[PDB]
């Protein structure tokens, strides 16, 4: 049977000994000259496991069987060389102990459970002498002296108590357990409430020891164990000088003392000394355990280096907890520079022979033997080591070697599941790695020598896991926002456009006609006899419209074979079933799409048959296509496009010849008539028409008005003349170029932002096409670096957001189908402008990312269609509801989301659901927990970090900290009236009776005039909206709503798109905990989990009626504070100061259950997800005929 929990019990003397196998009740260990322990010590193998292969220290039967190896004078049990990695040891100590973690942690686990003047008392209860007053013994020497403590050194009396830990030891033991459940459960109802506050806290350790099964006492160590050797190594450096684990030098003096005093007591009882000695006994352990503490770090004779300790070691910074989720190094790895894989079909991938081989040595090998060639395994090993220059036959193998299995890839800062994908790698020259286009997008796959990785999976499992879950091919869409990603672009586009833009000429006006102008036999000949050209204006036609009457798409094309037209002309041609105007160029697109699509007809469907193709354009198709066609196909499409576009995007040879960097003739007249509006605002200033303020805002709002003219103008000209101009087209289509940029190139730049956010009233007339001058540069400069500080400080903070995020919901997973809940949510379609207050529906996207794939909770009627209760609404579907409200017939689109969905430790399928990015109801087990996280921060990237908005808020949010200027909130409901002006500012929220004095700092921008009307917890002043303060007086959901949304607001304000769901999921845990009042079992506060509260608050009134419901309240945590209180510890560690966590924990039993990711991973289990879930892994496959040889051995 395999694991299914991990309970941390305490450390017992009896048990510390129980283990240890040996008993390093011996000196130091090593021997340099002769590698050997040291007749009993730290390495004496006899007590642990054998250093070598099975064998003793002298030599015995390294026989596999018999069990129980030892000797005459060589008792080195023969059971391999590894076990040196767990078998512990022990130094049965001299007398008392203190595992610091109960002394100087945070609460002082002992100096609490027993009071002992918080601190200073324990502190003086061993070291600094000071004697404790233990027993017995009738009590007052010059004053009573209350069965409790101390007495000062030369503050006579005597002892009949002692000192050292023995004190606190026999102390703990003799200490009524339950009575304190009464001596505290009497000072809990009749107290003052000042220091009768810690009263309770006593129990929290108390009861923690009781209903736990863990005894105290043991806190003082009667056994100070010894970790294994193969763990605190003694490796040989460069010859004879070694490198101990640094820890081992601690355990050192730890024995050094326990021996030096172990003698003093055997002989020579000089009191004062015995004292000055034990003082070190602890300080020994003290160090060893948590060296660093107090103010004196151990001084290795020489350096001033602190040297680890039991603490440090476990203390992340790769301390057994973190070290896992931070690194480790592969066995079948290999990285490299990446390069274009033009040819490469999607799913395919790079990998040059050179590495490609070294990264497969294994399989190759055997496969070789299994082939007539290369006799014996190892024998083979020798032929691929004959330096270089391989043979022929070989490779062939390497091929039949990989055909079938895939590899994973990854850029530098991976970020999303996509950040890695799999591909049927292929052998290929050049030493760099070849990679397919499309993908790029994901990894933000750049091409400037960047590199990626490649991991090799062996498990008949991991492999399958990959391609069916990680093939770029099977993964096309970004859960991040249910839209494509394998989106052709930054070229592919360019191509497609050109061949689907069509032309427009002008040497011909009085052209077309409803009734043939003169004739056709004429209209045309007028062409072979100059003037109006093929395509051109008209009321109903262009020469082409007649010159070319094509039957099949073929012809139209076969035409282009001969220099008649150029794809883009408007020719008459019968496609499928009718007459069509389109170009040889547009039509082709289709077929292209079509064929490789499979059905030349449904194709035409999705397609937007007439209009220049582009980013947005296809994308839909893209998505679309997928919609009504299996992923399989979807790809091929994506593919060819890639191709077809490419080769095309080149046959049509476009380029960049500066001249093409067009400047709209109206530049002059514009920079001319504008240049003049200035001599009229400065010569308008000469007098007094304008203040220095009314003035400066004019030269500014001046050039920007003209600037915008430059922009749009150079563009208008860009459509009526040169509609095929390189630059443009691009920007138009998807290729490259945004509205902005282009400008700076051709028309002009504008006004710059000073270093302190100002703007010189002097513009940048020149445009890059022109050699911008000396000054304009020195001022246009700031921008790139003050905007380079972004790419700067915005890159560092790894995933800062990401992490914190993660830690929280790594739990949350599809753990069931339908929480079963009726409860739903009211989705906001119409925004409420908190300023104008006037209304308006939301913008396109938002919506989608609010309803997309949501689940209806209470059916909806509108326009005649009826949306039953519970149907995954499709984009189309949501699309609909959209027009539905434009047509207003519905206000809040009710839906089942995660924000609620009760399943607790994960999410209910029909809640959230769908958007597997795959556009299909969410399959069970998915790691949404992450996913959410994942997505959310992926944009954290491009979020401005200048400071409020962007990232700087996100923190504020998730975390939740009363931002600057709190924003005055209406606690209650009522009326209002403002008072005073230019002295003492404030406002008043006076309902009926209670006129709440709502102040203002003398500088507030309020917005709820003087009179108005309301309802509970709301944005009064303006500014912000505090998390906690709200909640409290308005409920938990409420906040949530704000949260996400709020967050979203910035995201939206930066191009961020992303299903809301995600953000939600996060939020969820933000609630997870609640405080307590009127209890029925645990402490009267202990923060707490919802479910835990109800499987106990819906169980102490149902089957086990009585006690008390044990209510709670509204409690808010933030990622941070969050995780921290998560019940699990293994995970609980990894943060702040682990000590604490364990500390407390250990004490009471404390179990885990290993339900989570970060959980089962710190240990390296088989993640409770997907394949490692509870619904698709406990399945046994049958083979039709091998079910009837299993049906006759069952009825016997």
């Amino acid at each position: 049977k395999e694991v299914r929990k991990v309970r941390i019990a305490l450390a017992s003397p009896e048990k510390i000994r129980s283990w240890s196998y040996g008993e390093v009740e011996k000196p130091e260990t090593i021997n340099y000259r002769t590698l050997k322990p040291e007749r009993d010590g730290l390495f004496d193998e006899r007590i642990f496991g054998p250093i070598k292969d099975y064998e003793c220290a002298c030599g015995k039967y390294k026989r596999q069987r018999f069990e129980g190896k030892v000797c005459e004078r060589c008792g080195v049990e023969v059971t391999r060389s590894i076990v040196r990695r767990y078998r512990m040891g022990h130094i049965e100590l001299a007398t008392p102990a203190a595992h610091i973690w109960f002394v100087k942690d945070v609460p002082s686990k002992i100096g609490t459970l027993l009071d002992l003047s918080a601190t200073e008392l324990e502190q003086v209860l061993y070291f600094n002498k000071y004697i404790v007053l233990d027993p017995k013994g009738a009590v007052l020497d010059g004053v009573p002296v209350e069965k409790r403590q101390l007495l000062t050194d030369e503050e006579y009396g005597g002892i009949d108590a002692r000192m050292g830990a023995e004190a606190i030891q026999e102390l703990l033991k003799e200490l009524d357990l339950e009575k304190l459940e009464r001596e505290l459960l009497e000072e809990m109802k009749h107290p003052s409430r000042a220091r009768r506050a810690k009263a309770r806290k006593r129990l929290e350790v108390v009861r923690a020891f009781l209903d736990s099964g863990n005894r105290p006492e043991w806190m003082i160590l009667e056994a100070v164990p010894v970790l294994p050797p193969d763990l605190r190594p003694m490796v040989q450096v460069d010859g004879g000088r070694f490198a101990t684990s640094d820890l081992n030098d601690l355990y050192r003096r730890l024995i050094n003392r326990n021996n030096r005093l172990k003698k003093l007591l055997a002989q020579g009882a000089p009191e004062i000394i015995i004292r000055n000695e034990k003082r070190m006994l602890q300080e020994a352990v003290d160090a060893v355990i948590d060296n660093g503490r107090r103010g004196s770090p151990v001084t290795n004779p020489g350096s001033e280096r602190p040297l680890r300790s039991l603490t440090d070691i476990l203390s992340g910074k790769q301390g057994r907890f973190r070290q896992n989720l931070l690194g480790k190094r592969v066995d079948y790895s290999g990285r490299s520079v990446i390069v274009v894989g033009p040819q490469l079909k999607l799913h395919q991938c790079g990998l040059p022979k050179r590495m490609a081989l070294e990264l497969f040595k294994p399989f190759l090998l055997k496969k070789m033997e299994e082939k007539a060639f290369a006799p014996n395994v190892k024998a083979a090993r020798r032929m691929l080591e004959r330096q270089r220059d391989i043979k022929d036959e070989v490779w062939d193998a390497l091929e039949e070697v990989i055909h079938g299995k895939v590899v994973l890839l990854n850029r530098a800062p991976t970020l999303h599941r996509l950040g890695i994908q799999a591909f049927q790698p292929v052998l290929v020259e050049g030493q760099s790695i070849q990679l397919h286009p499309l993908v790029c997008e994901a990894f933000n796959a750049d091409f400037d020598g960047d590199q990626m990785a490649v991991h090799v999976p062996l498990s008949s499992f991991a492999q399958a896991e990959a391609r069916i879950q990680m093939l770029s091919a099977h993964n096309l869409l970004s859960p991040a926002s249910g839209e494509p990603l394998a989106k052709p672009s930054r070229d592919i586009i360019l191509g497609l456009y050109y061949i689907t833009q069509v032309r427009k000429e002008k040497k011909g006006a009085g052209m077309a006609f409803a009734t043939p102008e003169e004739a056709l036999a004429a209209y045309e000949r007028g062409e072979v006899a100059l003037n109006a050209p093929i395509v051109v204006a008209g009321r109903e036609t262009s020469v082409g419209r007649l010159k070319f009457v094509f039957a099949n798409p073929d012809e139209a094309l076969l035409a282009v074979a001969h220099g008649l037209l150029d794809l883009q002309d408007v020719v008459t041609v019968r496609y499928l079933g009718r007459r069509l105007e389109t170009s040889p160029g547009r039509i082709l697109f289709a077929r292209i799409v079509g064929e490789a699509v499979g059905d030349e007809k449904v194709a035409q469907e999705l397609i937007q048959m007439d209009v220049p193709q582009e980013k947005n354009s296809l994308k839909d198709l893209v998505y679309q296509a997928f919609l009504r066609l299996g992923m399989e196909k979807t790809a091929r499409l994506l593919d060819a496009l890639k191709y077809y576009g490419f080769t095309l995007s080149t046959t049509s040879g476009i380029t960049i010849g500066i001249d093409d960097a067009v400047i709209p003739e109206e530049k002059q007249r514009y920079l001319e008539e504008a240049d003049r509006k200035l001599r009229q605002i400065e010569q308008a200033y000469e007098m007094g028409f304008l203040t220095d303020r009314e003035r400066y805002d004019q030269v500014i709002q001046l050039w920007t008005e003209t600037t915008e003219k430059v922009t749009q103008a150079v563009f208008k000209n860009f459509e009526e003349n040169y509609p095929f101009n390189p630059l443009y087209v691009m920007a138009q289509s998807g290729a490259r170029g945004n509205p902005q940029q282009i400008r700076q190139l051709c028309g002009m730049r504008g006004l710059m932002q000073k270093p302190s956010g100002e703007t010189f009233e002097v513009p940048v007339r020149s445009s890059f096409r022109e050699g911008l001058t000396v000054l304009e540069y020195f001022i246009s400069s700031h921008g790139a670096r003050k905007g380079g500080a972004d790419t700067a400080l915005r890159t560092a903070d790894s995933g800062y957001l990401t992490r914190k995020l993660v830690d929280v919901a790594h739990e949350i997973v599809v753990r069931e189908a339908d929480c079963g809940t009726t409860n739903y949510i009211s989705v906001p379609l119409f925004q409420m402008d908190e300023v104008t207050r006037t209304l308006r529906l939301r913008k396109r996207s938002d919506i989608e990312s609010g309803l997309y794939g949501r689940v209806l909770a209470r059916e909806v009627e509108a326009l005649g269609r009826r949306l039953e209760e519970g149907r995954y609404l499709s984009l189309e579907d949501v699309h609909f509801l959209i027009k539905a409200a434009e047509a207003g017939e519905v206000r809040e689109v009710p839906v089942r989301s995660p924000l609620t969905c009760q399943t607790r430790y994960g999410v209910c399928q029909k809640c959230y659901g769908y958007d597997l990015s795959m556009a299909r109801p969410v399959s069970i087990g998915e790691a949404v927990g992450v996913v959410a996280a994942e997505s959310i921060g992926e944009p954290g990237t491009q979020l401005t970090m200048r400071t409020t908005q962007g990232l700087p808020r996100v923190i504020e949010l998730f975390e939740a900290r009363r931002p600057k200027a709190k924003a005055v909130i209406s606690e209650i409901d009522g009326v209002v009236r403002i008072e005073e002006g230019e002295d003492r500012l404030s406002v008043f929220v006076e309902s009926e009776g209670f006129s709440k004095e709502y102040k203002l700092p003398k500088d507030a921008r309020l917005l709820v005039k003087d009179g108005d009307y309301v309802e509970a917890g709301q944005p009064l002043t303006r500014g912000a909206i505090d998390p906690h303060q709200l909640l409290e007086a308005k409920g938990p959901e409420a906040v949530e709503r704000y949260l996400v949304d709020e967050i979203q607001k910035v995201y939206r304000a930066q191009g961020v798109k992303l299903h809301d769901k995600h953000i939600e999921i996060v939020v969820r845990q933000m609630l997870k905990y609640v405080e307590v009042t009127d209890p029925g079992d645990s402490r009267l506060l202990e923060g707490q989990v919802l479910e835990k509260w109800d499987v106990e608050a819906l169980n102490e009134r149902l089957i086990a009626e009585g006690k008390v419901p044990v209510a709670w309240k509204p409690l808010l945590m933030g990622v941070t504070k969050s995780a921290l209180s998560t019940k699990s510890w293994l995970s609980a560690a990894s943060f702040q100061n682990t000590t604490h966590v364990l500390t407390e924990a250990a004490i009471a039993g404390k179990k885990d259950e290993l339900i989570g990711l970060k959980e089962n991973v710190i240990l390296g289990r088989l993640i409770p997800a997907g394949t490692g879930s509870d619904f698709v892994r406990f399945t046994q496959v049958v083979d039709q005929r091998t079910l009837k040889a299993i049906e006759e051995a069952r009825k016997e």
Binding site: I8, G327, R329, F363, G1170, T1171
Partner: protein
Amino acid sequence: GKAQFGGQRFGEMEVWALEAYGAAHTLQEMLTIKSDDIEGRNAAYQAIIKGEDVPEPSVPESFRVLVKELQALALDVQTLDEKDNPVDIFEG
């Protein structure tokens, strides 16, 4: 790397996403026979030399390590299942 070379790293991100996909094993095989768990790497290494399923590591190194780095600092750190019962986490 004396004879043959290199040894690629692997970070959290990697995992989380790995987590992103129900990459179960792809995750586990990425945390074992390809790094610490000495048992495996050899075990596995051998495994292909003959071509078998290959891994299936008993219980990941690190788990034991830690538990031991634990006791190697007090605290039993036991192990139970679904019925809450004694484990046998080290068999040696």
